[PDB]
């Protein structure tokens, strides 16, 4: 897991330091924006199935043939529809880790590592997960710069799909 | 049973010492395994060796 | 002394002499009146058996007065006298209340019993006694089962026997049984492994995963690695013990695998010109090269060789080599 | 301990089903041919001190430097131990083969026998070459093709029983390998 | 590794003694049946990907709290280190179709292998039980007349189920 | 190696649920105390070795047998690496003060410490008494006012002398 | 349990030898001049528990932060202990005087006692000071050079077995050197 | 390592004075055998292979047990593995009779020779039998004086042959 402090305390044991004031301006950089983007995570959560029924919604309509086709990697039938709503679910809730810790240390762990094992296995396109977090993006009706934290870590995952 | 070849050294950076107690910036982070690492850290250094030995092709 | 084709004997120098010499049981129904050197050997026997060669001083003695006058007409011994010696403030103070409820159990089956359990189904019918009927029935539960009413009639003293087949425990708990006793110059919390605060076998007993059975007295016996579980479920770490498997192409890329058990290393020994280094001595992160000791290693047969050079150039003790 | 009947039942457990009509067929066969099995092990203990005989009379013909003074079976207590060592093992697995799972040979003898004998001293390659003498020694018994004692059976072919204590013998010597 | 050629070397290995006559013509059997063993793991190694993928989703079908939040095979993590273990029993099977006896899948990978699922936490009777949707999707694979002239393997995929069922007893 | 933040976001994924409203602020109270625990480290690094020399000096003036000849940590190679453990945890306590957690403190240091002290033969109850020596030193500059407006820091410094107490109870 | 009459015995039986009279005659050099090891004896066990009254008294008159705050002989209680300690080795010296071996010390006391005065924290320089003292403590008696006390003797050489016991006083400081 | 001037001042630093002068004139003794050892290197390491050749012409005859089908050193790298084996025994005590002591013969070879014959199966019995076919053939090859003055060496023989029987206990 890294943090801004997880990675202070990390180039500080590799040169047997004493956390000096380089390592204490690291670590109060992450206090001046734990405020913005605490906020953005409480906001994400409490939309949280507007947001991910829209997002399902939406990747049906720009692709219709997961709805249509038969087979049980697609969308076409009660329980394709429940795990497609799950998987973004699992999706937006990595981000508002990201926004408590402050980095993409548990979107690496929990959900990067081993993502394109399962994506050639299943038969699951990872373009179907762009569309439903490019919903996401512009759909969360944050601003400011509680909106500049929401979209740092909606796009690290959509480039760790592409 | 045929030892090797006799060669001769030169003068490189690595067999003199640098003086560099608390080393900067350009230090080359050693990824070890007696930090105890966690699962996410592992992979860190899994990385490092591939970076390592082969390229970051 | 080491040997076990030495004079045919193979554990007499494993450190069970006086524990295969002496049987102690006692010769008269009740204990006669005028002498006074004949039953007051058989005391300072059980004070030792019993609490584990522990310290027993005559300030605590005085102290329990009463329990051992007892046996010497009303009492049976081993049934009642050390069942009396069990219930009192210095086997609560040693035994029961610095240490947790498993490690309570699992020391008492040694001072007791003369064993170690296996798995947790002996300790679920011990601890099934301890939170719903107390303390008096807890230790009691050992004293009338078919445990204590077979080995032992009821005039000897309870002995150790956690290594014969007739004891019909395991093969596992023999791996446990030189792991509580080391020798006769011990105790329970003169023992490395635990002390009084500490509990002796949480995860060996319990998985019931036999160990490297070291003999006791030997060159570099003083190592034990200490315990993380790997894994991300448990969310463990990486580092610190070697594996307990040795599965894959590494199992028979170099024959047959083996795990040694490297006791300790130091800053003097790694160079191989007899001294240290005079400089800074260290890196900069300010570590050793083996940052802590007492580690292990898992390697094949073709790679014995060069191993046990590089342990034994840098002043590594060994304490013993198991094959995996 | 584990039975092949208690085996379909954490089999039907973790997958939470009842007990169908599938994994029922393989159990009422094992009904029919319980007989068989039943007249396979009378015959493995009761010629079980020649098994025990010839374990280890025919091992130490082909090493002898056990009985040499200073060997690993030269005094008259390792010389009862060795006789007494090998008939608890081939007593296990008579129970093993009843219950069908090799895992009551697991618990109670095979975890562990491997770190108690390289602390007891005793080598494990004159172990196994003593295991694999009661190997051949087992399988001609279940067939009745023994010389010198052939014993009452019915007739038939038990070839998937007699690989079935050759399946036992091998995992008695890879535990002490 | 070993396979039965090996056998009878170290078998007789250990005392000198030759091969004697009668065993061959029982090794000269087996090369009758060498055509009837390659087919057949080239039935299990065309389809390397669909018993394994249309298994682990059988799995997590009958057993939902694997695949649930905070059970063993939850993350991505451990949802590919669940599908590398179901493929590697099926790589060391067929390696021991093609060699005549287990001695390369017991002694590199299950020699150890319910000893690293107690240490990890792992359900180890319900590895057991992909290994047997495994099974019978590999036994009924290698009963097909496509592609072969139609011969009689009943001999041949007992031992091929035979090994399937050692795995499903190593593990528990 | 994890973090305050960190910690309580394990323990939401292995749940499966997202963060409730009462650990935002159990969080958002844990980010304006952090000027407080800035002040606090920056006090035990700007004397990072005037702590652990009149530490040092504390302990030799009060135990007298470690510096005897035939002692433990007599000589000039056993005295550096006394001096080497007794600023490396006055180190690793400093780093498990900035995270909010102490999983940096024992798996970097206290994983087995006491059993390489076990090794080398190190006396280690005077040790614990050396941690002892060293955390009234370091809530004595945390409560110093100098330099600093005037609040209340009064569980932090708890909370830092609990990391002392939990590295000074496994070394003995 | 060895003693030196059959020390040889473990010798021989790698020879299996039945002993001609060559080897035999140290034995009868130990049944020559064992009674200056018997009267060395009751030169010990009557003056025994005196060794020990200055053990750690002259190694507390040099070393003496151990009855200071976080010393090992600051109670009573961890005082007793430690001269229970050093009464509880002598006594296992002597064992082996008489016996003729190096048996006892090393099949009891140190077969685990380099982990037990690690497990307490014992200091091992202290704790082979006060022996280095009770290794001059205990030749005494045996050469009578005592500044404080005479033996009634008859006047030869023990040197042989003076000697002796700091040939045992060496390997109790094997383990904890 | 350490060596047999070194204990003399291992004794005075963990004793911690300065020099008796009872210590000083005990090393003339080791110079009164200091040309006598020199010369009885040259009676061990001039003949090297011969010693080894001597000893385990002798060894497979009396005990035939190693030369049998299924016996131990069965092999040629098991046999190779003998003759790397019966030399180090050796080596090592050439090592310790330069030094004097034998903690450098406990360091490099002895600490992990019971548990490692054990762990391989190789017997205890007969490896202290390569100690005892060695022990005889070295007792007549150091005690003859051919190019060296004659007198007393009577000490140093029971020492290269208390070297041999600690290396003979120290391994059954
Ligand atoms: C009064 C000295 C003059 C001077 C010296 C100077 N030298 C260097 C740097 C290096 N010198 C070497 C040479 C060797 N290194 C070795 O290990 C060996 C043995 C094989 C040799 C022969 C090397 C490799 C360096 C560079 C690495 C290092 O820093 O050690 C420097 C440092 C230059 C800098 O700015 O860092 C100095 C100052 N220079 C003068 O001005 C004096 C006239
Ligand atoms: C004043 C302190 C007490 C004391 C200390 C002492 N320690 C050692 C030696 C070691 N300690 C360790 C353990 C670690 N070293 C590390 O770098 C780390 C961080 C990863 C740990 C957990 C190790 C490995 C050694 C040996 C190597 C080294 O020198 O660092 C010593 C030296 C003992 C020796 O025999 O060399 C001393 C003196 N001892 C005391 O008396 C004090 C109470
Ligand atoms: C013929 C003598 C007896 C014998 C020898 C034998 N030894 C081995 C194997 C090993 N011996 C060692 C020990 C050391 N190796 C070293 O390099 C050193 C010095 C640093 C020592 C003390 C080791 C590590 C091995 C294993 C690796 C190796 O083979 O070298 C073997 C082989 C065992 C096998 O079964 O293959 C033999 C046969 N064994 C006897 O029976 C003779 C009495
Ligand atoms: C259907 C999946 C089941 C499951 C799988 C699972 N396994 C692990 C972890 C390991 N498995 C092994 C075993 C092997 N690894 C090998 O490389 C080989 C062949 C050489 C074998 C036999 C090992 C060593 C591990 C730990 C290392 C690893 O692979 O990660 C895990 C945990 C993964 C983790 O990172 O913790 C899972 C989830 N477990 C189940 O619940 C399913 C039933
Ligand atoms: C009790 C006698 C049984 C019985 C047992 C069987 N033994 C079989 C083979 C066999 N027997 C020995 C022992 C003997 N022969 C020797 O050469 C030596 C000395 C080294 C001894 C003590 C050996 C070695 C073997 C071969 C096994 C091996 O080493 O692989 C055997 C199988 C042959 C057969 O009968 O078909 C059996 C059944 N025989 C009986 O019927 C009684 C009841
Ligand atoms: C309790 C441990 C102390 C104490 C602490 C307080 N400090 C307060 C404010 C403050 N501190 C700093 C310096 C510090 N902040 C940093 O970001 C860095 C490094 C980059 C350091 C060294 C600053 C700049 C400030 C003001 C703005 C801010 O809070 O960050 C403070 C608040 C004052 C108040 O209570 O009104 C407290 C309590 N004060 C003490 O007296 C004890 C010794
Ligand atoms: C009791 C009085 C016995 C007795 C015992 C003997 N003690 C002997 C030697 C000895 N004692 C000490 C301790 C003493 N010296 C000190 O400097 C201090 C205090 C700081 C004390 C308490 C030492 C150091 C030694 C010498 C040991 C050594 O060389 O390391 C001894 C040997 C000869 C002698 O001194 O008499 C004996 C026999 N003496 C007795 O006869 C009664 C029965
Ligand atoms: C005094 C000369 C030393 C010293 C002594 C201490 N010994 C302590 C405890 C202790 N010692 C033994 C071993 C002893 N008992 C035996 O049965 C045998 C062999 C037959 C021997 C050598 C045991 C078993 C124990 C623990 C007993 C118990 O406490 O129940 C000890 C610690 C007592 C305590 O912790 O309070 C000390 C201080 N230590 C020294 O520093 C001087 C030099
Ligand atoms: C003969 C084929 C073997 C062999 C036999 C020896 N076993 C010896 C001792 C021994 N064995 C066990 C395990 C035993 N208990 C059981 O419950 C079972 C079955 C599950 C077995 C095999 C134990 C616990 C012991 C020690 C007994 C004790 O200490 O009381 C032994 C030596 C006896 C001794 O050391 O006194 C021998 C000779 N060993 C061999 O060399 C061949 C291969
Ligand atoms: C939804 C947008 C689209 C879709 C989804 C779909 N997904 C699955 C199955 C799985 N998805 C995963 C993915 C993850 N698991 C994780 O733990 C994490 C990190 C937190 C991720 C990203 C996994 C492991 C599976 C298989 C197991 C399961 O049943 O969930 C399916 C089912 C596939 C099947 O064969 O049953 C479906 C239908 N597919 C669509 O059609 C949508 C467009
Ligand atoms: C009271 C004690 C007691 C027993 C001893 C067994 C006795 C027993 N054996 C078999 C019966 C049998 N047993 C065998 C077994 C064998 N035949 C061979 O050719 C091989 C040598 C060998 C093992 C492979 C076979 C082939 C049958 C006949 C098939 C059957 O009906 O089971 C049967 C069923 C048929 C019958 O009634 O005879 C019974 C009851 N059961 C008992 O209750
Ligand atoms: C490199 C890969 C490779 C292979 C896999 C085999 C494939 C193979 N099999 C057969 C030939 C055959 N193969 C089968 C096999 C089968 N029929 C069944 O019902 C089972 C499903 C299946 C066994 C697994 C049969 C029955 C024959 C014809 C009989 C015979 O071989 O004589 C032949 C024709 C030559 C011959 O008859 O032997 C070939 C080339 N050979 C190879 O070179
Ligand atoms: C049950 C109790 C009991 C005993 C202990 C022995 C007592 C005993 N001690 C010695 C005898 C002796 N003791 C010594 C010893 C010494 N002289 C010195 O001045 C030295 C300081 C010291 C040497 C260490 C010597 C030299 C002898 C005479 C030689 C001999 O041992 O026979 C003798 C032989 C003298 C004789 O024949 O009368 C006897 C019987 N016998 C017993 O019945
Ligand atoms: C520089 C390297 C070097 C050597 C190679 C040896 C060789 C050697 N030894 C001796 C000298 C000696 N060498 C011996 C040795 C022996 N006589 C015996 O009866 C034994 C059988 C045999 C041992 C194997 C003796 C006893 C002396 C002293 C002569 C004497 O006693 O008068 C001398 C004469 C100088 C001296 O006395 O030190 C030399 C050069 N010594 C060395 O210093």
Same mark, same amino acid.
């Given at each position: 897991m890294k943090t801004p402090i997880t990675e202070a305390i990390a180039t500080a044991d590799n040169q047997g330091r004493f956390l000096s004031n380089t390592e204490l301006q690291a670590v109060n950089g992450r206090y001046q924006r734990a !405020?913005?983007?605490? !906020?953005?995570?409480?906001?994400? !959560? %409490?939309? =949280?199935?507007?947001?991910?029924? %829209? =997002?399902?919604? =939406?990747?049906?309509?720009?692709?219709?043939?997961?709805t249509q086709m038969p087979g049980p990697a697609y969308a076409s039938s009660a329980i394709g529809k429940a795990k497609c709503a799950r998987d973004i679910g699992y999706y937006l809730r990595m981000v508002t880790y990201c926004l408590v810790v402050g980095g993409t240390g548990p979107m690496d762990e929990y959900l990067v590592a081993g993502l394109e094992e399962i994506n050639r296995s299943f038969d699951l396109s990872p373009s179907w997960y762009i569309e439903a977090l490019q919903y996401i993006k512009n759909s969360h009706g944050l601003s400011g710069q509680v909106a500049n934290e929401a979209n740092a870590y909606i796009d690290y995952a959509i480039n760790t799909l592409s | 049973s045929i030892p090797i070849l006799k060669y001769s050294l030169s003068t490189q950076n690595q067999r003199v010492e640098s003086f560099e107690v608390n080393p900067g910036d350009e230090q080359y982070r050693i990824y070890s395994t007696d930090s105890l690492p966690s699962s996410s850290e592992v992979d860190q250094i899994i990385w490092a060796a591939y970076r390592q030995i082969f390229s970051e092709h | 002394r080491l040997g076990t084709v030495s004079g045919n004997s193979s554990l007499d120098k494993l450190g069970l002499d006086k524990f295969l010499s002496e049987s102690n049981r006692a010769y008269t129904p009740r204990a006669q009146p005028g002498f006074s050197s004949e039953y007051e050997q058989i005391i300072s026997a059980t004070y030792k058996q019993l609490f584990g060669n522990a310290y027993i001083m005559d300030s605590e003695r005085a102290e329990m007065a009463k329990?051992?006058?007892?046996?010497?007409?009303?009492?049976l011994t081993l049934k009642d006298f050390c069942r009396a010696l069990?219930? /009192?403030?210095?086997?609560?103070?040693?035994?029961?209340? #610095?240490?947790?409820?498993? +490690?309570?159990?699992?020391?008492?089956?040694?001072?007791?019993? *003369?064993? /170690?359990?296996? +798995?947790?189904?002996?300790?679920?019918?011990? #601890?099934?006694? @301890?939170?719903?009927? +107390?303390?008096?029935?807890?230790?009691?539960?050992?004293?009338?089962?078919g445990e204590y009413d077979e080995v032992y009639d009821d005039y000897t003293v309870p002995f150790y026997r956690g290594y014969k087949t007739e004891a019909n425990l395991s093969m596992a708990a023999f791996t446990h049984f030189f792991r509580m006793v080391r020798g006769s110059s011990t105790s329970d919390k003169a023992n490395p492994n635990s002390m009084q605060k500490d509990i002796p076998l949480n995860y060996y007993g319990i998985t019931k995963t036999?160990?490297?059975?070291?003999?006791?007295?030997?060159?570099?016996?003083? @190592? /034990?690695? #200490?315990?993380?579980? /790997?894994? #991300?479920?448990?969310?463990?770490?990486? *580092?610190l013990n070697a594996a307990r498997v040795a599965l894959g192409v590494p199992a028979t890329a170099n024959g047959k695998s083996f795990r040694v058990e490297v006791t300790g290393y130091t800053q003097p020994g790694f160079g191989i010109t007899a001294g240290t280094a005079v400089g800074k001595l260290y890196k900069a992160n300010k570590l050793s090269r083996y940052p802590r000791s007492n580690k292990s290693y898992v390697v094949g047969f073709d790679e014995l060789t060069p191993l046990y050079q590089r342990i034994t150039k840098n002043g590594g003790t060994i304490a013993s080599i198991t094959p995996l | 301990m584990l039975d092949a009947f208690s085996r379909v039942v954490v089999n039907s457990d973790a997958?939470?089903?009842?007990?169908?009509?599938?994994?029922?067929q393989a159990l009422k066969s094992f009904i029919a041919d319980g007989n068989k099995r039943l007249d396979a092990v009378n015959s493995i203990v009761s010629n079980a001190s020649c098994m025990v005989s010839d374990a280890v009379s025919g091992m130490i013909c082909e090493n002898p430097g056990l009985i040499s003074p200073?060997?690993?079976?030269?005094?008259?207590?390792?010389?009862?131990?060795?006789?007494?060592?090998?008939?608890?093992?081939?007593?296990?697995?008579?129970?093993?083969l009843l219950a069908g799972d090799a895992s009551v040979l697991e618990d109670r003898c095979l975890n562990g026998l491997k770190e108690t004998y390289i602390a007891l001293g005793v080598p494990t390659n004159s172990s196994i070459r003593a295991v694999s003498i009661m190997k051949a020694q087992a399988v001609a018994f279940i067939t009745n093709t023994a010389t010198e004692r052939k014993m009452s059976f019915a007739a038939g072919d038990c070839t998937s029983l007699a690989s079935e204590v050759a399946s036992y013998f091998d995992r008695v010597g890879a535990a002490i390998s | 590794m070993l396979d039965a050629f090996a056998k009878v070397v170290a078998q007789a290995d250990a005392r000198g003694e030759f091969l004697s006559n009668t065993q061959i013509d029982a090794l000269s059997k087996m090369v009758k049946e060498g055509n009837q063993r390659l087919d057949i793991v080239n039935k299990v190694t065309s389809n390397a990907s669909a018993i394994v993928t249309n298994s682990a989703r059988a799995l997590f079908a009958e057993q939902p709290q694997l695949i649930q939040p905070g059970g063993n095979a939850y993350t991505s993590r451990r949802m590919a280190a669940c599908l590398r273990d179901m493929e590697i029993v099926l790589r060391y099977v067929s390696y021991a179709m093609i060699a005549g006896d287990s001695s390369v899948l017991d002694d590199r990978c299950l020699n150890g292998l319910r000893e690293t699922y107690q240490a990890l936490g792992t359900p180890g009777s319900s590895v057991a039980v992909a290994?047997?949707?495994?099974?019978?999707?590999?036994?009924?694979?290698?009963?097909?007349?496509?592609?072969?002239?139609?011969?009689?393997?009943?001999?041949?995929?007992?031992?091929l189920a035979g090994y399937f069922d050692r795995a499903a007893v190593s593990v528990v």
């Amino acid at each position: 897991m890294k943090t801004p402090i997880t990675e202070a305390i990390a180039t500080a044991d590799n040169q047997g330091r004493f956390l000096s004031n380089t390592e204490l301006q690291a670590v109060n950089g992450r206090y001046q924006r734990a !405020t913005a983007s605490l !906020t953005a995570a409480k906001a994400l !959560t %409490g939309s =949280a199935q507007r947001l991910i029924t %829209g =997002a399902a919604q =939406a990747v049906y309509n720009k692709f219709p043939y997961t709805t249509q086709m038969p087979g049980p990697a697609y969308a076409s039938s009660a329980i394709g529809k429940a795990k497609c709503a799950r998987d973004i679910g699992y999706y937006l809730r990595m981000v508002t880790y990201c926004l408590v810790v402050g980095g993409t240390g548990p979107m690496d762990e929990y959900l990067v590592a081993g993502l394109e094992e399962i994506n050639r296995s299943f038969d699951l396109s990872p373009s179907w997960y762009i569309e439903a977090l490019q919903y996401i993006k512009n759909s969360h009706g944050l601003s400011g710069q509680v909106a500049n934290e929401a979209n740092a870590y909606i796009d690290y995952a959509i480039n760790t799909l592409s | 049973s045929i030892p090797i070849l006799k060669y001769s050294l030169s003068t490189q950076n690595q067999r003199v010492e640098s003086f560099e107690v608390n080393p900067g910036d350009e230090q080359y982070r050693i990824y070890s395994t007696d930090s105890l690492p966690s699962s996410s850290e592992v992979d860190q250094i899994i990385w490092a060796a591939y970076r390592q030995i082969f390229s970051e092709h | 002394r080491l040997g076990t084709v030495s004079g045919n004997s193979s554990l007499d120098k494993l450190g069970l002499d006086k524990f295969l010499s002496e049987s102690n049981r006692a010769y008269t129904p009740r204990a006669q009146p005028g002498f006074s050197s004949e039953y007051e050997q058989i005391i300072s026997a059980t004070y030792k058996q019993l609490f584990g060669n522990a310290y027993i001083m005559d300030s605590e003695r005085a102290e329990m007065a009463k329990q051992e006058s007892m046996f010497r007409d009303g009492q049976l011994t081993l049934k009642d006298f050390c069942r009396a010696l069990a219930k /009192t403030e210095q086997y609560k103070k040693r035994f029961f209340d #610095s240490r947790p409820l498993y +490690g309570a159990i699992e020391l008492n089956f040694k001072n007791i019993l *003369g064993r /170690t359990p296996d +798995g947790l189904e002996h300790y679920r019918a011990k #601890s099934a006694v @301890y939170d719903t009927k +107390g303390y008096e029935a807890f230790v009691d539960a050992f004293f009338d089962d078919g445990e204590y009413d077979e080995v032992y009639d009821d005039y000897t003293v309870p002995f150790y026997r956690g290594y014969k087949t007739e004891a019909n425990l395991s093969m596992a708990a023999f791996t446990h049984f030189f792991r509580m006793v080391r020798g006769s110059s011990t105790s329970d919390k003169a023992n490395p492994n635990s002390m009084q605060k500490d509990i002796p076998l949480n995860y060996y007993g319990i998985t019931k995963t036999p160990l490297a059975v070291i003999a006791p007295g030997a060159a570099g016996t003083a @190592y /034990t690695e #200490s315990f993380a579980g /790997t894994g #991300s479920w448990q969310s463990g770490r990486a *580092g610190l013990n070697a594996a307990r498997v040795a599965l894959g192409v590494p199992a028979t890329a170099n024959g047959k695998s083996f795990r040694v058990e490297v006791t300790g290393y130091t800053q003097p020994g790694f160079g191989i010109t007899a001294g240290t280094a005079v400089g800074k001595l260290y890196k900069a992160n300010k570590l050793s090269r083996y940052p802590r000791s007492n580690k292990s290693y898992v390697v094949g047969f073709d790679e014995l060789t060069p191993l046990y050079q590089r342990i034994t150039k840098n002043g590594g003790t060994i304490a013993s080599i198991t094959p995996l | 301990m584990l039975d092949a009947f208690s085996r379909v039942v954490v089999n039907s457990d973790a997958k939470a089903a009842y007990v169908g009509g599938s994994d029922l067929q393989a159990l009422k066969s094992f009904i029919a041919d319980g007989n068989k099995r039943l007249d396979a092990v009378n015959s493995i203990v009761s010629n079980a001190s020649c098994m025990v005989s010839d374990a280890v009379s025919g091992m130490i013909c082909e090493n002898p430097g056990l009985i040499s003074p200073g060997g690993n079976c030269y005094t008259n207590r390792r010389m009862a131990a060795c006789l007494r060592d090998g008939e608890i093992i081939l007593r296990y697995v008579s129970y093993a083969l009843l219950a069908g799972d090799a895992s009551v040979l697991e618990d109670r003898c095979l975890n562990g026998l491997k770190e108690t004998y390289i602390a007891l001293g005793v080598p494990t390659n004159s172990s196994i070459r003593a295991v694999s003498i009661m190997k051949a020694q087992a399988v001609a018994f279940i067939t009745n093709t023994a010389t010198e004692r052939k014993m009452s059976f019915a007739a038939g072919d038990c070839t998937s029983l007699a690989s079935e204590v050759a399946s036992y013998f091998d995992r008695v010597g890879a535990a002490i390998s | 590794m070993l396979d039965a050629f090996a056998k009878v070397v170290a078998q007789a290995d250990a005392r000198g003694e030759f091969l004697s006559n009668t065993q061959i013509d029982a090794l000269s059997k087996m090369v009758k049946e060498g055509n009837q063993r390659l087919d057949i793991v080239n039935k299990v190694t065309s389809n390397a990907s669909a018993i394994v993928t249309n298994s682990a989703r059988a799995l997590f079908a009958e057993q939902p709290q694997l695949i649930q939040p905070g059970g063993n095979a939850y993350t991505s993590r451990r949802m590919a280190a669940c599908l590398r273990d179901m493929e590697i029993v099926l790589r060391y099977v067929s390696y021991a179709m093609i060699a005549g006896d287990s001695s390369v899948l017991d002694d590199r990978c299950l020699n150890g292998l319910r000893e690293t699922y107690q240490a990890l936490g792992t359900p180890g009777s319900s590895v057991a039980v992909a290994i047997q949707k495994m099974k019978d999707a590999s036994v009924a694979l290698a009963n097909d007349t496509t592609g072969t002239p139609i011969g009689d393997c009943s001999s041949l995929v007992a031992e091929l189920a035979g090994y399937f069922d050692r795995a499903a007893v190593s593990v528990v």
